[PDB]
Each structure stands twice: as structure tokens, then as C-alpha cells.
């Protein structure tokens, strides 16, 4: 066949992964295209204020079955998709099915029980993607995702803006608000038996930038996907906050800084 209509069919044995992926992006991005390519099943979208960007990839080798006839895009209301995936059991096998310019997407949930559920959602017509540069960052911090999540929630109780600075002393998160000021300093620490417990700091040049904590706290919705989080900083770029998706991909969040007028 050559005049085939594009078609997508994905069978993911660990359905819980896809549920956690949607929970990681649905509050940041309302509607977006899921893109289909040889490499895998991906999404790139900004938040509605254009302050943050999410770039997501689920690689083809993580699916039990991976058909991506040509380069489909599925225009998806992420909240509606999330609502349908919330009906999958954490141990369900999940199958996504859609036609190139099709009007609906079908989700199949199969239990490993003789229970089979079919959910059918309307698609939307959605676009223009940004080019992400392959830059060299001035500093990279890797740390346990739960520790970063705790730090962001704690500081956000004190103020709205966090200064992240990397120096020879370590990584410092600072905030000031109506009730006082807070400074949290992590130094490099690899004195651990499990490397995902480490705090690793690689500084090529010192860097200090300011960011809205509200966005940082939405990023930490991806914590259940990844024992680890990597924060990449340079004074000329958004910060990058990267989570692993099991062993089959990633979610990267980019956040534009706050700067003096």
C-alpha cells in the first residue's frame, strides 16, 4: 500500500506509566498534539502564558506494539484524556488507536481478569513547534526528585520567586516573602550506596537565576515517574528540569527566568 491513511496503534503493557505522564502535563497544558514518529510517541507544548514549555518522549521500544504509519498528530484535550485514563486500572494494558486525520481516538484497557474497556474520545485540530537548541549549560544538578519536590513546596509557602544559584559552595535555593526569608543549600554528596540517592553538581561556570515557584511546583507533578531529577542552568537560557519516564523516555520542562527590567 502507498495511498494508506495514516494510523497509530500503541500497546503499552505498563498502563500506569501513561496515567502518570498525563498527570504530569495536564495542569500545565490544556490542549496539545501528540506527535508520532519512528523514534516514538512525543509531545511538545507551551503553557497558555508561554512561560513554560513541556517536551515529552515515550520511545517506541517501550511499547509492546508500536505502529505509527507516517507522522500522525492527535490533537488532544489533555484534561479529557486524563479523565479517560483515570478509568484505567494501574495494572491494565492500555492500547491507543487513532486515524491520521481521524475524528476520534480509542483507548482500550485490558486487564492481565477477563475485563476489557473501550473508551472513545473526540480529537481536535491543532501546530508550530519551537526549535530547542542543543546548548551547553553552565551548571547541572542531579538530585532525588522527592527532595526537589519538597524544596519547591517548602519555599513556595514562604514566597513566589526562587533564586537558584550554583557556586563552588553548592546549589542554593533562596526565597523571600512577607513572613521572612529562606535559603536552602545542597552540597554535592555521593556518599550513598544507591546512586539515585546522590546529589551531583557539575558546574562549568557559576550561575544564578530567578524563577516562579508556581511553575516549579507544577513540574514536580512528574515525581512519581522518576527517582531522580536533573536541573540544567545557564544564564542565557530557560532552566531545564528533566524527569525520566520509567526506562523508556523523558519529560523535560523548560521555564523562562524572571530578570531585572
Amino acid at each position: 500500500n502507498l495511498y494508506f491513511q495514516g494510523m497509530l496503534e500503541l500497546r503499552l503493557v505498563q498502563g500506569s506509566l501513561l496515567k502518570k505522564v498525563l498527570e504530569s502535563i495536564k495542569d500545565l497544558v490544556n490542549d496539545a498534539n501528540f506527535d508520532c514518529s519512528s523514534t516514538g510517541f512525543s509531545l511538545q507544548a507551551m503553557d497558555s502564558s508561554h512561560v513554560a514549555l513541556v517536551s515529552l518522549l515515550l520511545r517506541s521500544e517501550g511499547f509492546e506494539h508500536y505502529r505509527c504509519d507516517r507522522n500522525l498528530s492527535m490533537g488532544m484535550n489533555l484534561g479529557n484524556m486524563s479523565k479517560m485514563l483515570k478509568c484505567a486500572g494501574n495494572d491494565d494494558i492500555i492500547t491507543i488507536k487513532a486515524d491520521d486525520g481521524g475524528d476520534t481516538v480509542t483507548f482500550m484497557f485490558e486487564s492481565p481478569q477477563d475485563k476489557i474497556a473501550d473508551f472513545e474520545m473526540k480529537l481536535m485540530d491543532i501546530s508550530e513547534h519551537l526549535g530547542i537548541p542543543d546548548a551547553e549549560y553552565h551548571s547541572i544538578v542531579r538530585m532525588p526528585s522527592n527532595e526537589f519536590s519538597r524544596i519547591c513546596k517548602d519555599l513556595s509557602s514562604i514566597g513566589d520567586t526562587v533564586v537558584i544559584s550554583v557556586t563552588k559552595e553548592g546549589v542554593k535555593f533562596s526565597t523571600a516573602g512577607d513572613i521572612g526569608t529562606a535559603n536552602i543549600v545542597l552540597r554535592q554528596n555521593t556518599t550513598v550506596d544507591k546512586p539515585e540517592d546522590a546529589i551531583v553538581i557539575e558546574m562549568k561556570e557559576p550561575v544564578s537565576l530567578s524563577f516562579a515557584l508556581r511553575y516549579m511546583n507544577s513540574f514536580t507533578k512528574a515525581t512519581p515517574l522518576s527517582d531522580t531529577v536533573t536541573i540544567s542552568l545557564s544564564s542565557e537560557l530557560p532552566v531545564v528540569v528533566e524527569y525520566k519516564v520509567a526506562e523508556m523516555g523523558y519529560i523535560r520542562y523548560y521555564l523562562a527566568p524572571k530578570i531585572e527590567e
Binding site: 508561554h50 512561560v51 519551537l130 523548560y254 523562562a256 524572571k258 531585572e260 527590567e261
Partner: peptide, 14 residues
């Protein structure tokens, strides 16, 4: 005062 920059100030439209 601080100003919130945008992603569009940094990345091109590809």
C-alpha cells in the same frame, strides 16, 4: 522589579 520573560524570547519557531 523583576519581569517574567517568555520561552518565545529564547527559542525560535523551527
Amino acid at each position: 522589579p523583576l519581569v517574567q520573560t517568555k520561552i518565545i524570547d529564547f527559542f525560535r519557531i523551527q
